[PDB]
């Protein structure tokens, strides 16, 4: 009777950077996933655990949606059980992940605003974010907090220009995370 919000989350004007990713959730409605596997814009549309083709039958309790901006080369890295620059220090999925991940090819619609995190002394726990800006003191010497030798900024900026950029085309990926059955569920298929 009231279709769950999907249109604006998969199609709006502003997408946050990878280092700080918004986490939208859905409380109470019916969500026909018909538009998902239909439109050709969704390039990857790769799904794990529960079946991709028949998601209507399930009756989950809380569906969580988060949005990234990835350089495009690292899209294959988003999958669980993968290692690299961004899956270790920016966003880590649990091994038994439930849900789907979707990747676009949006370069024409969308610079210097996008920026990611590069430096840390440890990996991130699953489903954890870190809005922290403090120079990590690379050298053994104490670091005051002013840019200098052995003191590097933890955040670095992408450069997005309309080259060929087959690996460097700025991509936007949204991964749907599905929770278990805590309370009487309020989202299903029909």
């Amino acid at each position, epitope marked *: 009777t009231n279709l769950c919000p999907f249109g604006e989350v998969f199609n709006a004007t502003r997408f946050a950077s990878v280092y700080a990713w918004n986490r939208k959730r859905i409380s109470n409605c019916v969500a026909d996933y018909s538009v998902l596997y239909n439109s050709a814009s969704f390039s990857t549309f790769k799904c794990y655990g529960v079946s991709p083709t028949k998601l209507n039958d399930l009756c989950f309790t809380n569906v969580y949606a988060d949005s990234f901006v990835i350089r495009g080369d690292e899209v294959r890295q988003i999958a669980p059980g993968q290692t690299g*620059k961004i899956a270790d220090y920016n966003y880590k999925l649990p091994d038994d992940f439930t849900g789907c991940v979707i990747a676009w090819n949006s370069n024409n619609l969308d610079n210097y605003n996008y920026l990611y995190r590069l430096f840390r002394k440890s990996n991130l726990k699953p489903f954890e974010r870190d809005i922290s800006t403090e120079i990590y003191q690379a050298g*053994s010497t104490p670091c005051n907090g002013v840019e200098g030798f052995n003191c*590097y900024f933890p955040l670095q900026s992408y450069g997005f220009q309309p080259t060929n950029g087959v690996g460097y085309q700025p991509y936007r990926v949204v991964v749907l995370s599905f929770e278990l059955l805590h309370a009487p569920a309020t989202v299903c298929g029909p």
Partner: single-chain antibody
């Protein structure tokens, strides 16, 4: 700050060996490390990277025969070798890795082991007299961003160092005689007021794109 190495010898094929890269004034547990191979005359190559978190990668060409390890109890980096082949003989370097703010700020001293995307540098030899500008151009096989590429110089019998990092950005301690440009897929390096001290070989290197690749190598001549 100084990096030092301790290994070497003569080993028959299939034998074992290990190499130690010990640091001073630079913590190894929190900073990137990388091992590179210099074949006897071919050029340079990339062998491994250890991220600070603990993750490790390897060169796609050879991964099983090597195994890199991190040691935090001695601020050092051990590299272990399963077995050796005749094709594997080369001199080895260990160098700190910075992704964008510089590429390889510091380099080791070099140890010897024996056995019992594409880049191209156009000019080639470019033998010119003193005081004459020498122009070197490195072209990429595929389209690349203006950043993500560096420029290295190898004095004879010396460890490699960098001159210009990230297109035209100049690192500390380098005279202002070097300033490279960036236009499309063609990159150039210019040396002004040529001096007899700078007889060496220059390499163009890319980072971040893929398993790191180095150019064939060109030698300036006086």
């Amino acid at each position: 700050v100084q990096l030092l190495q301790s290994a070497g010898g003569l080993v028959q094929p299939g034998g074992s060996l290990r190499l130690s890269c010990a640091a001073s004034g630079l913590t190894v547990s929190a900073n990137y490390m990388s091992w590179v191979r210099q074949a006897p005359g071919k050029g340079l190559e990339w062998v491994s990277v250890i991220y600070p978190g603990g993750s490790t990668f390897y060169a796609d060409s050879v991964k099983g025969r090597f195994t890199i390890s991190r040691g935090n109890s001695k601020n050092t980096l051990y590299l272990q070798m399963n077995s050796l082949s005749v094709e594997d003989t080369a001199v080895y370097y260990c160098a700190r890795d910075l992704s964008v703010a510089g590429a390889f700020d510091i380099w080791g001293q070099g140890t010897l082991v024996t056995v019992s995307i594409v880049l191209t540098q156009s000019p080639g030899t470019l033998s010119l007299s003193a005081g004459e500008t020498a122009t070197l151009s490195c072209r990429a096989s595929q389209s690349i961003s203006t950043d993500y590429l560096a420029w290295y110089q190898q004095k004879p019998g010396q460890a490699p160092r960098l001159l210009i990092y990230g297109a035209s950005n100049r690192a500390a301690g380098i005279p202002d005689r070097f300033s490279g440009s960036a236009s499309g897929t063609d990159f150039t390096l210019t040396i002004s007021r040529l001096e007899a001290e700078d007889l060496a070989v220059y390499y163009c290197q890319q980072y971040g794109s893929s398993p790191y690749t180095f150019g064939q190598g060109t030698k300036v001549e006086i």
